[PDB]
Design a protein around this nucleic acid. Sequence first.
RNA 1: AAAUUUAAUAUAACUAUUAAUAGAAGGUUACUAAUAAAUUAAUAAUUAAUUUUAAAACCUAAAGGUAAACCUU
RNA 2: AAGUAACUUAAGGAUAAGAAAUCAACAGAGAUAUUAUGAGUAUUGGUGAGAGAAAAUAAUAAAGGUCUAAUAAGUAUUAUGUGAAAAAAAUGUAAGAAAAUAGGAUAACAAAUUCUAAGACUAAAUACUAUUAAUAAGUAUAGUAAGUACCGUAAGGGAAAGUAUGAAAAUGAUUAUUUUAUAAGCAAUCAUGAAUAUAUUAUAUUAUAUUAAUGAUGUACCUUUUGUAUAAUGGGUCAGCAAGUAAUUAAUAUUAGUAAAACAAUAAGUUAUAAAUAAAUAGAAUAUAUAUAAAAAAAUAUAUUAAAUAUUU
RNA 3: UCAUCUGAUUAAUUGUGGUUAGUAGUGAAAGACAAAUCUGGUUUGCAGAUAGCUGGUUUUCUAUGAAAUAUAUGUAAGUA
RNA 4: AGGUAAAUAAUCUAAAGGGAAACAGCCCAGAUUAAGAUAUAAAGUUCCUAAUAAAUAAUAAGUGAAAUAAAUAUUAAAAU
RNA 5: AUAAUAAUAAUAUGGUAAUAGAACAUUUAAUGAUAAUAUAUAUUAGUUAUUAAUUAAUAUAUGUAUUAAUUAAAUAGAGAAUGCUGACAUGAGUAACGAAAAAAAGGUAUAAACCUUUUCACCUAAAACAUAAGGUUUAACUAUAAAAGUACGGCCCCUAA
RNA 6: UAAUGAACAAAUAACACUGAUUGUAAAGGUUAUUGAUAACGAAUAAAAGUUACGCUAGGGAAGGGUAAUAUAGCGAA
RNA 7: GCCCGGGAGUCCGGGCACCA
Lengths: 154, 62, 212
Amino acid sequence: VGDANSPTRHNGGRALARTAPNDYTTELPSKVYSMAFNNALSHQYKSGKLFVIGGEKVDLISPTPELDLNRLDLIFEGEVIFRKFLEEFQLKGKRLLFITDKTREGLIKSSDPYKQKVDVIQKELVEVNDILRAQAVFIELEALEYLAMAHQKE
Amino acid sequence: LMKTHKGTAKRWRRTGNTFKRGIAGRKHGNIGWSHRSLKALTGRKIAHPAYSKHLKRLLPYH
Amino acid sequence: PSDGSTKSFKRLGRGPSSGLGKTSGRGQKGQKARGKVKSWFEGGQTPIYKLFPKIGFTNVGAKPLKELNLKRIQWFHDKNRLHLQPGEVLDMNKMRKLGLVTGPIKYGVKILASGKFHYNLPIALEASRASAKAIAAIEKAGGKFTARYYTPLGLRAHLNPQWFLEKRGRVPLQARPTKRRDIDFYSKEEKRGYLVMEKDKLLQDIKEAQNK
RNA sequence: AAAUUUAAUAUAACUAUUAAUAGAAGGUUACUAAUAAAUUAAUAAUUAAUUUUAAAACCUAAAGGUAAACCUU
RNA sequence: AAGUAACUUAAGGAUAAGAAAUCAACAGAGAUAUUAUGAGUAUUGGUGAGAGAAAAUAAUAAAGGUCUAAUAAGUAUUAUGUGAAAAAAAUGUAAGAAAAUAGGAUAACAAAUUCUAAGACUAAAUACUAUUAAUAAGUAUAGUAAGUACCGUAAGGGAAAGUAUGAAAAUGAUUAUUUUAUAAGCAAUCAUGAAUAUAUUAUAUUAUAUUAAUGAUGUACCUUUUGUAUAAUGGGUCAGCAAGUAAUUAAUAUUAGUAAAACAAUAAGUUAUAAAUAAAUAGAAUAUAUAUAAAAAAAUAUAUUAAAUAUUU
RNA sequence: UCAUCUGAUUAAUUGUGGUUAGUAGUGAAAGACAAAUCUGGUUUGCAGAUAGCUGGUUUUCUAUGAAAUAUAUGUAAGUA
RNA sequence: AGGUAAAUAAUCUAAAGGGAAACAGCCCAGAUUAAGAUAUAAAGUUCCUAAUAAAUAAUAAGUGAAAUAAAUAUUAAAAU
RNA sequence: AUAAUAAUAAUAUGGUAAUAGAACAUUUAAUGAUAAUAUAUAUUAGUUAUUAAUUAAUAUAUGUAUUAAUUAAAUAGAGAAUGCUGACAUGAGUAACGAAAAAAAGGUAUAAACCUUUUCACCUAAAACAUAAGGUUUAACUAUAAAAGUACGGCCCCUAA
RNA sequence: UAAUGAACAAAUAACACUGAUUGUAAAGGUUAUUGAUAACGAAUAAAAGUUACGCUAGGGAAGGGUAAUAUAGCGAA
RNA sequence: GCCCGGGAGUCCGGGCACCA
Ligand SMILES: [Mg+2]
Ligand SMILES: [Mg+2]
Ligand SMILES: [Mg+2]
Ligand SMILES: [Mg+2]
Ligand SMILES: [Mg+2]
Ligand SMILES: [Mg+2]
Ligand SMILES: [Mg+2]
Ligand SMILES: [Mg+2]
Ligand SMILES: [Mg+2]
Ligand SMILES: [Mg+2]
Ligand SMILES: [Mg+2]
Ligand SMILES: [Mg+2]
Ligand SMILES: [Mg+2]
Ligand SMILES: [Mg+2]
Ligand SMILES: [Mg+2]
Ligand SMILES: [Mg+2]
Ligand SMILES: [Mg+2]
Ligand SMILES: [Mg+2]
Ligand SMILES: [Mg+2]
Ligand SMILES: [Mg+2]
Ligand SMILES: [Mg+2]
Ligand SMILES: [Mg+2]
Ligand SMILES: [Mg+2]
Ligand SMILES: [Mg+2]
Ligand SMILES: [Mg+2]
Ligand SMILES: [Mg+2]
Ligand SMILES: [Mg+2]
Ligand SMILES: [Mg+2]
Ligand SMILES: [Mg+2]
Ligand SMILES: [Mg+2]
Ligand SMILES: [Mg+2]
Ligand SMILES: [Mg+2]
Ligand SMILES: [Mg+2]
Ligand SMILES: [Mg+2]
Ligand SMILES: [Mg+2]
Ligand SMILES: [Mg+2]
Ligand SMILES: [Mg+2]
Ligand SMILES: [Mg+2]
Ligand SMILES: [Mg+2]
Ligand SMILES: [Mg+2]
Ligand SMILES: [Mg+2]
């Protein structure tokens, strides 16, 4: 017997212990990442679960209706509206992802009752996982454009 | 991090894939031996395959 | 993941049938089998490092130049990725901008004649030097080569003076050569150096000094 | 229309990271070693913030000693 | 190993460092602190084990500059003994300067550059603690008890232990079925009667299960060995725990992305794009032409390389 | 422990307190003792010292499958 | 010398199966899993124990019958 | 011009050290239907060329899977360390129960062992009576060990080492 | 067919190869040569004993074989 | 190798480097 710290004995240490902050971070070429992002988006579009929202920037064929805007934004009434929307679109239980050009605080507030199934993400911080995870994605037109620019090709 | 074995570096030098080195045996005790024979002991020489692995490990950045 | 990307790693000491059972690829009972012995240990015979004489020295004054072949330039021209009517001289900076010479440039560029037989561009070229053959080729083409001197800092300035401008609203002027060898090189006619092709003041000054 | 589940939260865990903020009583046994306000905001009681205020034995190198919780001034 | 452990002393919320007698190279920069690159490069070592910068470019950072010295000798310097494996700045002992018309900085000298010692202050990035908030392919033997019980004269060491549930095993008693008092050996396997049990298709001359009639076959397992039934090692049985992991690099492979470029794209930088030489101002059209090295007037000769209506490696 | 044996006014025995010990004391000297035993204690730390040595290294299935020779070795239990 | 040192070949090492009573190294034969009809290897065929019948000689000692003990002596038998 | 499965012919399939290839169990993370007629675990009997899973019956949970599957990872698999911890065996109901003198009657149709009486014994310059030190207060105990001091100690005064 | 010795560190010459701010130098390198490690692939410039007071890790890195000798017996004399 | 002590030479004894 040696000291009582040998992993051979019940009270002792662990052999080949893992220690404090374990670093699991890995690399990926930026281009590859961009491609992956693009691919994800494409997949979503193919599914038909990509929905784009916008107005101010492009000429509209049909005129934007009253009582509803193109900002991706909303007891507080907003929550009720959100609920109604959900009911309409048959996507109550399923997880959804709002990709937003800026911090639409109101929207987030409205959604937070359904926080478990709702991601609300700022443009720059959207992840491939988040898109893939989401059963239906709602994105601003401007945000979409930005994303495209980012993960271009050249 | 890992580092070159400096002795090895001093002795050996990288030429394409392999390494070159000075022939051993010429420093002294040369007289009486034929100068045509000692011509062979001058000049560089290329690393034998046997020891290439070792060389590689020794000098990982060459 | 893509087929062929990943393998299972070999799990040692995990039962006999796995293949790497008890001894776990080590064999029996050696120093190797438990303790560490340096991979390149030779058994005590004088090692490959210790046997041979140590040779040469590293010239720290040396400045290795990036080589650039006429052939590459020609290829670029053919492609149409070479825009030189705006800037009539193709200097090192210009080359780097183009892509022509890629990666970092520490000391300078030497032009080399690889595709001299197929080179035909009536262009003004500037670099740290060029092989005789290359020079000849250039002259045949009806082109004009001159070989300039750049110190590290000077070279850096040349490559992107924009940065310098951004920093301190100025570009540092070009240093004269000071090392005798360098001076000699630039004087030489055959090397096509910028001291005699431009008729520099420095040379004149030197001459004056010699006289008096 | 109340219950059930799911996820989060305590005065009630530690460990690592990241971000913010700041740089603080133990014992012993007993003649047990306690509190009192005011002002301001919120709404007479109120909670909070800002304050002043009473008590608090003995021991824990240097009133001076000793064999810590004792003795001597 | 290592100026690490340890001991000792002293201060503070932080401390240290800090506005060049610094770096550099004749072009320049402009305090410190420490992270990427530079770079495992220069430097160095019984030239072994091994050790290893700086400039420069980037980040992090804060307003980062600013006088508090009547501007500094037993000081600089020298000799000598010590002194961060590479780069000095320090220091014991004695000798001992100079006024910006002057000093320091490099084996040495000559030029030239640059800074001004012997006077000073300095936030921020940082270290450690404590609290709060968040995130956990973290912990219920890293989940609050206890520094208690107990052990030691002492320094010191140091347990168990949440609540439910529990047909887990080892282990004990008992009952049932079956075998067993003329039989001898890893206690199993295969053959093979008989007895018992269960079975909602046993229709039976049935099927499974249990069971040491009887026969044949059968030197435990591991370790270590030329070789083990060995009378060589190890294990009383069961349950739980007990061993190829991580960081920073290098080389090969496979697949993916991009591709004469790749990664990063603030600028750098890394690898590739040209081989060779100790090094130097040298360097590419079938080879018999050419490049580099030794040689030389130039070839030859040796080695390695490049080079074949087209679209570069 | 029992028996037997030796000293038993002394270089005697013994109580109470104190001093000297870990490169290290004490020692009519045996390397004897320094808290059940020391050619130099114990505890904490350096610390996961080092070990060419011993032991151990946990599922299965497939394919291939050796060596114990030479050379060198402060080397012959190792390693190239 | 079941010794020691090398040479050649095999086997064992790392090889189970049949034989050699038992057997690392001998004699045959290389087990992917079964099945069990036909060839068989080495070894065997009174029983134990899977399988046998013949021919010609010799032996009378239990010689011998899967591990041959020598010089020599005696007795016989052939040949010259 | 592929894959999956099935044929036909052929060759190959012992294996230590070792190399190569392919799977399964366990646990965690990402995605994720479903349902008490469901699930999880266990026992028994089946099934599939079977370390695994599944079927049926049975028992216990549980308003119910980090469930199927694909990835990512691992404190990822144990008869082998004179391993470690816990539990339980074996020797075994064996050795021993530690210097030894007990008896009766009664407490008490409860006593070899507690108490009382009597008898007998043992120690007696002690196994007695006073004390010092020491210590889980062990005592004749909580209703508890009483001091102005003189063959009473401390503190106190005074010093030794 | 033997007549020999690595690297490292020193030393002497030649080379014109680099010359750490430039120029010189110093220093290094290239070429040629020098002296030994005989335990002769050379651990360091430099190294002997004892332990029955010893300790740790390990390994075994009278029996069995043989019958030279011994005893005993035979054949020949 | 260099310098001594007993013009050149021999024969002897001291040192001084070399000692990787
Ligand atoms: Mg194996
Ligand atoms: Mg071995
Ligand atoms: Mg082993
Ligand atoms: Mg081995
Ligand atoms: Mg007192
Ligand atoms: Mg300070
Ligand atoms: Mg200061
Ligand atoms: Mg260091
Ligand atoms: Mg100053
Ligand atoms: Mg005790
Ligand atoms: Mg055997
Ligand atoms: Mg045993
Ligand atoms: Mg005493
Ligand atoms: Mg003695
Ligand atoms: Mg004594
Ligand atoms: Mg095979
Ligand atoms: Mg060894
Ligand atoms: Mg033998
Ligand atoms: Mg073996
Ligand atoms: Mg066999
Ligand atoms: Mg074989
Ligand atoms: Mg076979
Ligand atoms: Mg017989
Ligand atoms: Mg016989
Ligand atoms: Mg096989
Ligand atoms: Mg494990
Ligand atoms: Mg187990
Ligand atoms: Mg097993
Ligand atoms: Mg075990
Ligand atoms: Mg018995
Ligand atoms: Mg008995
Ligand atoms: Mg008894
Ligand atoms: Mg008794
Ligand atoms: Mg009675
Ligand atoms: Mg008396
Ligand atoms: Mg008494
Ligand atoms: Mg030697
Ligand atoms: Mg030797
Ligand atoms: Mg020696
Ligand atoms: Mg013997
Ligand atoms: Mg014998």
